[PDB]
Amino acid sequence: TRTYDGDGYKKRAACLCFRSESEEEVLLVSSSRHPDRWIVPGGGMEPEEEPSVAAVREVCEEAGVKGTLGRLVGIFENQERKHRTYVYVLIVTEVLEDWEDSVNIGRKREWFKIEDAIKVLQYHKPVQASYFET
Numbered sequence: 001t002r003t004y005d006g007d008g009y010k011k012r013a014a015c016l017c018f019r020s021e022s023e024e025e026v027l028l029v030s031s032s033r034h035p036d037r038w039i040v041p042g043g044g045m046e047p048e049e050e051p052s053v054a055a056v057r058e059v060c061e062e063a064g065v066k067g068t069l070g071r072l073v074g075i076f077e078n079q080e081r082k083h084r085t086y087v088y089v090l091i092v093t094e095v096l097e098d099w100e101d102s103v104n105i106g107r108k109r110e111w112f113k114i115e116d117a118i119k120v121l122q123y124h125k126p127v128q129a130s131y132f133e134t
Ligand SMILES: O=P(O)(O)O[C@@H]1[C@@H](OP(=O)(O)O)[C@H](OP(=O)(O)O)[C@H](OP(=O)(O)OP(=O)(O)O)[C@H](OP(=O)(O)O)[C@H]1OP(=O)(O)O
Pocket: 002, 010, 012, 030, 031, 032, 033, 034, 039, 042, 043, 044, 045, 062, 081
């Protein structure tokens, strides 16, 4: 069930899933519709779902990782697609081998240096590239 702010923007949550507290390497996942593209794992908040809970749930489903939830980075609008996304830091402590989207749609995941994550997000996902700007 998709949820919306009062202005009709889709409510989303995502995590910057870092390999370590150094925040040098981040986990991206393949696009479901376009598997040759990389995106930040995240997705729609459910009714009455806290954004931090939605963020952790979505990165479990999409990326097959768990870890220590860190700070809210910010709230990022996508004016073109009418999304409003809460973005959190997650320090990955668990990497699971056969996760929901790997089983269901063969979703891929890969570690990127921050600079390279920004590079591969820029063309299709410039708002997700901006998640890293701070
Ligand atoms: O417009 P396009 O570019 O097609 O954006 C897609 C997006 O594709 P990209 O892979 O290019 O990012 C999807 O993400 P992935 O399934 O790949 O993760 C979904 O986004 P979300 O993460 O919010 O959703 P979910 O909770 O993970 O399913 C989807 O939303 P939806 O599933 O609710 O229809 C969204 O459509 P909208 O614009 O209608 O929002």
